[PDB]
Paper text:
In this study, we heterologously expressed and fully characterized a recombinant polyol-specific long-chain GoSLDH. The observed results suggested that GoSLDH is highly specific towards D-sorbitol, mannitol, and D-arabinitol. Measurement of activity with D-sorbitol as a substrate suggested that GoSLDH is exclusively an NADP+-dependent enzyme, resulting in only 2.5% relative activity with NAD+.
The identified GoSLDH had 32–82% sequence identity with polyol-specific long-chain dehydrogenase family enzymes. Further, the catalytic region of Pseudomonas fluorescens MDH (PfMDH) was identified as the previously suggested conserved sequence (KXXXXNXXH) of polyol-specific long-chain dehydrogenase. To understand the binding conformation of D-sorbitol along with GoSLDH and PfMDH, molecular docking was performed. D-Sorbitol formed strong interactions of five hydrogen bonds with GoSLDH, with Asn190, Lys294, and Leu191 playing the roles of interacting amino acids. The distance between Lys294 and the O2 hydrogen atom of D-sorbitol was 2.35 Å, which favors close contact. These observations suggested that recombinant GoSLDH is more catalytically efficient than other SLDH or MDH due to the close proximity of D-sorbitol to the catalytic residue, along with high binding affinity.
Residue numbers in the entry: 1 to 484
Write the structure that this text describes.
């Protein structure tokens, strides 16, 4: 059956919004209505709407392309309702019709319409998922780019903007001038200290617009940082058909996500917020510790699994996590090297986190390619492994497993698995010089790759020697033979 406000007589297997859809009112405006938002932010709000019905979400798309209009039409056609299938590693899935998103507006169609929502006193939070590039931070200067075409145009006619920066700042100006209150700017993009990024972008535009205005926003608005997870894959036509065939719903906008989900959010709101804790959102004073748990256990674990997995010849993460030796090595790395040198946030155990990392990697429906996980391996090693290596060296702890990860990465770079297959991993930051080292036939040259610069200031003598010893074993007897 098609999805509609009236046709909410879904099959016994499909759950419906757990609240009166007619009783909820808008409290959040969201920029960038993508899959992640619909399966994460919208997901948590859906669970507190029965408690505080004034937090419905008004979605806004920034592009007015021919494809954008179609999407907006499909949403309105289903009363903005859509189905979300949640699949667990056990293979079992559940499906529900989400009602938190009460309107979907195409900004270009009517700029004033968006601004009206933005200035409404009931709208106390403005969230967004616009990707990193969406924040318009120049990669070289690290500052908000005032040279951007759309930004300059907005600066010329700020009363009728087209960029998120223009809409948000103009809305804040009007609220201020009319005696209203500032709202909370809540980034839900997966970036380190996403709130600080948002603050830089929005205040960067505000400053150019009017110093006094930026001062006001800086003092009254808030830009909390949040850590967000939840794998929510792209939805292809073929994927949509499987989801609908399984749910029994003729959904034009079906999506699926892993059952696992997490949201750590700094409790810094300008004018109130939903009771998100009731939905499992973890409110904190500083997001930093949680970001590092994810970085040093989930991300670090992902590559500790995939680098040697590629050498064994595994194409997907779920195939590698099923390998008894690679799994044991991952657990030993997390238990012996990371957990003992990782600060633990309150209200959770690092061991429980470890268990979730393992379980998630075993979710066949979510499984990604090992080579994809290994792409830009240099930057990943720098960000995910450096702290763990520095601590092991500084505190004089066992380097065996740490060296194995490095040796595996270096051997993986050579481009050949133990089954005879060849491959070419992607390393954007590497040039001819780097790749020459990576492919050298010796076992010492590639130790100079930039991937290991994060701990090069320390005495890496013992670590490097062990790495060499393991690379030798890996090349002659295979990767598993080198596992500590």
């Amino acid at each position: 059956m098609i999805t509609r406000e009236t046709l909410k007589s879904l099959p016994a297997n499909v759950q419906a919004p757990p609240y009166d859809i007619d009783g909820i009112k808008p409290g959040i405006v969201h920029f960038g209505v993508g899959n992640f938002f619909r399966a994460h932010e919208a997901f948590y709000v859906e669970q507190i709407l029965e408690h505080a019905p004034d937090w419905a979400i008004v979605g806004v798309g920034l592009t007015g392309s021919d494809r954008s209009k179609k999407k907006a039409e499909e949403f309105k056609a289903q009363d903005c309702l859509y189905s979300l299938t949640e699949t667990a590693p056990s293979g079992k899935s559940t499906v529900r019709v989400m009602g938190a998103l009460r309107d979907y507006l195409l900004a270009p169609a009517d700029p004033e319409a968006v601004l009206k929502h933005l200035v409404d006193p009931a709208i106390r939070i403005v969230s967004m998922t616009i990707t990193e590039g969406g924040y318009n931070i120049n990669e070289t200067t690290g500052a908000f780019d005032l040279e951007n075409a759309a930004v300059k145009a907005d600066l010329k006619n700020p009363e009728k903007p087209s960029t998120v920066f223009g809409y948000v700042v103009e809305a804040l100006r009007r609220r201020w001038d009319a005696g209203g209150k500032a709202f909370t700017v809540m980034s839900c993009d997966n970036l380190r200290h996403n709130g600080n990024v948002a603050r830089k972008a929005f205040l960067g535009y505000a400053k150019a617009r009017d110093p006094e205005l930026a001062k006001w926003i800086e003092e009254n608005a808030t830009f909390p940082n949040g850590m967000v997870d939840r794998i929510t894959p792209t939805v292809s036509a073929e994927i949509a058909k499987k989801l609908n065939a399984a749910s029994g719903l003729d959904d034009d906008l079906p999506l699926v996500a892993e059952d696992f989900h997490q949201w750590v959010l700094e409790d810094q709101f300008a004018d109130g917020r939903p009771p998100l804790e009731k939905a499992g959102v973890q409110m904190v004073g500083d997001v930093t510790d949680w970001e590092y748990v994810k970085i040093r256990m989930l991300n670090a674990g992902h590559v500790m699994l995939c680098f040697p997995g590629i050498l064994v010849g595994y194409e997907n993460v779920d195939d590698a996590i099923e390998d008894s030796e690679l799994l044991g090595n991952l657990k030993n790395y997390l238990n012996k090297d990371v957990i003992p040198t990782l600060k633990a946030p309150s209200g959770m155990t690092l061991e429980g986190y470890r268990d979730s990392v393992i379980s998630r990697f075993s979710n066949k429906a979510m499984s990604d390619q090992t080579l994809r996980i290994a792409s830009d391996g240099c930057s990943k090693v720098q960000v995910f492994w450096t702290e763990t290596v520095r601590r092991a060296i500084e505190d004089k702890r066992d380097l065996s497993r740490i060296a194995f990860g490095i040796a595996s990465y270096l051997e993986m770079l050579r481009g050949r698995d133990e089954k005879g297959g060849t491959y070419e991993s992607s390393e954007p930051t590497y040039g001819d010089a780097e790749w020459k080292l990576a492919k050298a036939d010796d076992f010492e040259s590639s130790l100079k790759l930039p991937a290991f610069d994060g701990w090069r200031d320390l005495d890496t003598s013992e670590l490097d020697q062990k790495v060499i010893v393991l690379r030798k074993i890996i090349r002659e007897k295979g990767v598993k033979a080198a596992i500590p």
